[PDB]
PDB file of C-alpha atoms in Angstrom:
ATOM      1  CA  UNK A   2     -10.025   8.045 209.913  1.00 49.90           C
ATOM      2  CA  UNK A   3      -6.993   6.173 209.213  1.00 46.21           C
ATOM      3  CA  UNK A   4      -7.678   4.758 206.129  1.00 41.60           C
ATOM      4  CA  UNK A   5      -6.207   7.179 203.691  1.00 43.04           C
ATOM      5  CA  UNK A   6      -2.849   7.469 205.743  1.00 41.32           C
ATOM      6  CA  UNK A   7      -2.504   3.605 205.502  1.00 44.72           C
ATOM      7  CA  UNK A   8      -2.656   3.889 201.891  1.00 44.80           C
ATOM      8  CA  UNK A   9      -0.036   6.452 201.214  1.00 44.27           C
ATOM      9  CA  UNK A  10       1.719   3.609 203.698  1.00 45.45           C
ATOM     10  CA  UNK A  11       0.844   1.270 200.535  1.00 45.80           C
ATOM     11  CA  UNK A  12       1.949   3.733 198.325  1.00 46.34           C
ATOM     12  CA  UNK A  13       5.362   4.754 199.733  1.00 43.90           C
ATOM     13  CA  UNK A  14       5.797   0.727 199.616  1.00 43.62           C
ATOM     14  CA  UNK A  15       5.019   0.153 196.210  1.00 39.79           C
ATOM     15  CA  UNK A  16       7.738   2.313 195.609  1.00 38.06           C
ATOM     16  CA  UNK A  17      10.011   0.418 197.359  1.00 37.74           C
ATOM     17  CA  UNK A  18       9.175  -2.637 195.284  1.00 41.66           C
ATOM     18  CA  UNK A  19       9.470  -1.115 192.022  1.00 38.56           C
ATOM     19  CA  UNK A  20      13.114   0.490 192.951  1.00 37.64           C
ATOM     20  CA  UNK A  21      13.953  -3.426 194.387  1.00 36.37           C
ATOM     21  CA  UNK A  22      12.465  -4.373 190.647  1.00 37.24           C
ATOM     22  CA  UNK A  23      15.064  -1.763 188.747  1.00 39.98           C
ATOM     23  CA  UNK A  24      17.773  -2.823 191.057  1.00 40.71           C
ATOM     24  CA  UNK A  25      17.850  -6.733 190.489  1.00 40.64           C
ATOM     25  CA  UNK A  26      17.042  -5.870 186.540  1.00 45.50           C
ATOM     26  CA  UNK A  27      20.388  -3.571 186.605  1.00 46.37           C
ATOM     27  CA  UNK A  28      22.132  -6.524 188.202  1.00 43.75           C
ATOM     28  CA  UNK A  29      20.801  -8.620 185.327  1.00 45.14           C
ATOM     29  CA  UNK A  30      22.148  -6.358 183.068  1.00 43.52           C
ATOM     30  CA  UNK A  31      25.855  -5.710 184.314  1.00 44.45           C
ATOM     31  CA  UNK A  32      28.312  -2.871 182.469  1.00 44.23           C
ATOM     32  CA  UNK A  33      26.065  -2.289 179.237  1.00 47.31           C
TER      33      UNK A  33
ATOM     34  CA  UNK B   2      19.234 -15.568 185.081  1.00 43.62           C
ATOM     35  CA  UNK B   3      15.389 -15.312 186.329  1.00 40.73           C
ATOM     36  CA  UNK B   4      16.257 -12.130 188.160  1.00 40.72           C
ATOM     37  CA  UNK B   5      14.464 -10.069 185.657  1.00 41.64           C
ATOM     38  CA  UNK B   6      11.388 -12.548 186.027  1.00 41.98           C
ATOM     39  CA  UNK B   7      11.404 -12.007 189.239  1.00 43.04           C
ATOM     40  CA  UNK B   8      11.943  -8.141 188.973  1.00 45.89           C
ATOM     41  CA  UNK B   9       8.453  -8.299 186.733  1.00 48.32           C
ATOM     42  CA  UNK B  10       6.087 -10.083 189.592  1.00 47.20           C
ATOM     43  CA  UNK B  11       7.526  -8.000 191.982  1.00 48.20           C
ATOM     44  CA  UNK B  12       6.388  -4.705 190.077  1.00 46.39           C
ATOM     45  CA  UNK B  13       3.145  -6.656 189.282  1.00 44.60           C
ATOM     46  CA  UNK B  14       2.807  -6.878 193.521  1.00 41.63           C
ATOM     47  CA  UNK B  15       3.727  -3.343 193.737  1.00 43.11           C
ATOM     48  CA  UNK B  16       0.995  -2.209 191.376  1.00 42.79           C
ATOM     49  CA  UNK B  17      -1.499  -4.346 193.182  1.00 41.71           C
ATOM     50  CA  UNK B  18      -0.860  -2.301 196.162  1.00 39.70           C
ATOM     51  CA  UNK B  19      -1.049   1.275 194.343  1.00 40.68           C
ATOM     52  CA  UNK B  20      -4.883  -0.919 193.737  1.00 42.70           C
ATOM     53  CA  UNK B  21      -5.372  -1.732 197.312  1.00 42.83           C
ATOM     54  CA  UNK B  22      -4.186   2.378 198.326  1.00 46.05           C
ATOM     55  CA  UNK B  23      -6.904   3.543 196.083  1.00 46.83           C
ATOM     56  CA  UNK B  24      -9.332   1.234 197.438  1.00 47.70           C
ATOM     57  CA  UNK B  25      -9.433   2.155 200.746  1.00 43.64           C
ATOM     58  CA  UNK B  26      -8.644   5.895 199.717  1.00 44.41           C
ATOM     59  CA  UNK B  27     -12.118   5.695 197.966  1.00 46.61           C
ATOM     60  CA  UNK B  28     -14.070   3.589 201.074  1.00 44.58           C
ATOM     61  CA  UNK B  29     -12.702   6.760 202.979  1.00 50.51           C
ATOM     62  CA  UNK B  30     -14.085   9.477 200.926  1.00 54.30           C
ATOM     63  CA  UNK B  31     -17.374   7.429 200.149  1.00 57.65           C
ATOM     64  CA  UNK B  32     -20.205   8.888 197.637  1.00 56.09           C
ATOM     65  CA  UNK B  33     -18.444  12.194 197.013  1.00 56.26           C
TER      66      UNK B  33
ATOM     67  CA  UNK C   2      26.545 -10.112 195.688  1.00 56.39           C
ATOM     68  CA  UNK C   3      23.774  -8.241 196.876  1.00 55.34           C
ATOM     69  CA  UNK C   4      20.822 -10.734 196.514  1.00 56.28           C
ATOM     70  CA  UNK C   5      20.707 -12.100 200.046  1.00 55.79           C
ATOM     71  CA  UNK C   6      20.745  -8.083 201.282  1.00 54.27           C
ATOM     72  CA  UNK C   7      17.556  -7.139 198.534  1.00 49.98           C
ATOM     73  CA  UNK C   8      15.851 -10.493 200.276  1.00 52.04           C
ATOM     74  CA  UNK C   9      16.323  -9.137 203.531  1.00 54.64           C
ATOM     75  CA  UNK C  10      14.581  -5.728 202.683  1.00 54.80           C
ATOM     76  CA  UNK C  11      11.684  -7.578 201.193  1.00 56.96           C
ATOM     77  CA  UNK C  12      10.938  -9.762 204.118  1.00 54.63           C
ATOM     78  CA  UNK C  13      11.059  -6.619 205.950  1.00 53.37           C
ATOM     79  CA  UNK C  14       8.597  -4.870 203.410  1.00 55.63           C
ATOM     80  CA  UNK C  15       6.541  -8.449 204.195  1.00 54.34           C
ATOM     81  CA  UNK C  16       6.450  -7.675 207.787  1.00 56.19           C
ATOM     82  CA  UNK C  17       5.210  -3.744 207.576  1.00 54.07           C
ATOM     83  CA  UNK C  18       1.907  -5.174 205.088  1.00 53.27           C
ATOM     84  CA  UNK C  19       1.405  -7.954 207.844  1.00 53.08           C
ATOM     85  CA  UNK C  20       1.192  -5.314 210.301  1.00 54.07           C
ATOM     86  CA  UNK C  21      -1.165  -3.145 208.023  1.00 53.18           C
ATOM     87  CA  UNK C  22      -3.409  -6.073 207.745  1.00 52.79           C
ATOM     88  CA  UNK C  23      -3.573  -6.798 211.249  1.00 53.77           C
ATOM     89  CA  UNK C  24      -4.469  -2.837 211.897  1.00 55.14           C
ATOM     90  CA  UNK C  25      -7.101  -2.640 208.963  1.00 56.03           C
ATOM     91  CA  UNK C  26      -9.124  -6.054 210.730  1.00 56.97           C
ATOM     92  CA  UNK C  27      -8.621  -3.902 214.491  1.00 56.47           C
ATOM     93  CA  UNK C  28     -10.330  -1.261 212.732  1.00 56.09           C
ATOM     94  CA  UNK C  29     -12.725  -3.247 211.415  1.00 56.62           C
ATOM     95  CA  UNK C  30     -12.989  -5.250 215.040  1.00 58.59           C
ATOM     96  CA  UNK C  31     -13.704  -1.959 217.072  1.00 59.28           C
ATOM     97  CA  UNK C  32     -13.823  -1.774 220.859  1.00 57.94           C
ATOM     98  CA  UNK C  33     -14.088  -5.840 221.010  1.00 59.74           C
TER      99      UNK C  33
ATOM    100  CA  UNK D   2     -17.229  -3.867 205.358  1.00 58.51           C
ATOM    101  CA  UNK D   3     -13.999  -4.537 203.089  1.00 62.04           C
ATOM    102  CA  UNK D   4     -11.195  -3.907 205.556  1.00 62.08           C
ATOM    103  CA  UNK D   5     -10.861  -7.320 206.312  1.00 62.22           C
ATOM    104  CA  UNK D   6     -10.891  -8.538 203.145  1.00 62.89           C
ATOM    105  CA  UNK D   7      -8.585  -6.111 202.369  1.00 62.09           C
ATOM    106  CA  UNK D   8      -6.451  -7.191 205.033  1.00 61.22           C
ATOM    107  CA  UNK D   9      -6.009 -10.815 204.067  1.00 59.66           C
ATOM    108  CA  UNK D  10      -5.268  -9.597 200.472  1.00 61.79           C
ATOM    109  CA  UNK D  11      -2.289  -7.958 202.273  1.00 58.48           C
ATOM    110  CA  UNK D  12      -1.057 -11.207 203.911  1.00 60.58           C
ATOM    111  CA  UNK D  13      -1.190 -12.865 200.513  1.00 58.99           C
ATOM    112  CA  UNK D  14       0.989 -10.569 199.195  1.00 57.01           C
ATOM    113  CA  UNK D  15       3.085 -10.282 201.991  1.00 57.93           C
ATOM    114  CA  UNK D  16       3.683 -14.382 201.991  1.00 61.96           C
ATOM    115  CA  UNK D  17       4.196 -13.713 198.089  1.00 59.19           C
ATOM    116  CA  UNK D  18       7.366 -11.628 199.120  1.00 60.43           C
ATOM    117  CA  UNK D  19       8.740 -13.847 201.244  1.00 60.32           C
ATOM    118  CA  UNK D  20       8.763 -16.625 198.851  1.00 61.69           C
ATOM    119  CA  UNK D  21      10.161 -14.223 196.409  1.00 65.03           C
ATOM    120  CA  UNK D  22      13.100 -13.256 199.469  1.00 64.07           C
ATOM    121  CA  UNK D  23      14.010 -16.945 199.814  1.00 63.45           C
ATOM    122  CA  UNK D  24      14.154 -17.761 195.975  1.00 62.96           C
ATOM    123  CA  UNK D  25      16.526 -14.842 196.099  1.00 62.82           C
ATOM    124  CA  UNK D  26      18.448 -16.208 198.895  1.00 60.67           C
ATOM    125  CA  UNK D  27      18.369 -19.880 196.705  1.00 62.44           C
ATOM    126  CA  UNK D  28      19.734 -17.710 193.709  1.00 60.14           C
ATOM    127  CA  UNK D  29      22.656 -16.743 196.071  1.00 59.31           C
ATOM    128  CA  UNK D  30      23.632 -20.252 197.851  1.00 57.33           C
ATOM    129  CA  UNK D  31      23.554 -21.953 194.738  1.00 56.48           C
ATOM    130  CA  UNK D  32      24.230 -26.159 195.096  1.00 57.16           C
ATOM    131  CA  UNK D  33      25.459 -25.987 198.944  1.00 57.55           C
TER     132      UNK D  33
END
């Protein structure tokens, strides 16, 4: 049924978290 | 500060869901 | 800077996996 | 079967990121 649609869901929001991840690590890192 | 910390956990979250997606991607397609 | 924005888009990320859990346990739950 | 299970692995996580939203938000307000 549904199941495999729901975890592309998961997927496509995993993604999310790991560009969230890069993006607070750039802030970390300023100019350099 | 602890904003790369936090950057880790949340790609540690985001890999537990890539788990959780393959989980129910394999309780859909079942023996095969 | 942009912290209080990134929190934002998690709690909304939060809110889309609540509502996946709560339509995983109606699929689970049935026609009850 | 799992889904359930599942599911309330999913609100764990979810809770995780809102925790992780407001420690972002602390981050920002500093001592006020």
């Amino acid at each position: 049924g549904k199941l495999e649609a729901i975890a592309q869901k998961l997927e496509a929001i995993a993604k999310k978290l790991e560009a969230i991840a890069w993006k607070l690590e750039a802030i970390a890192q300023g100019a350099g």
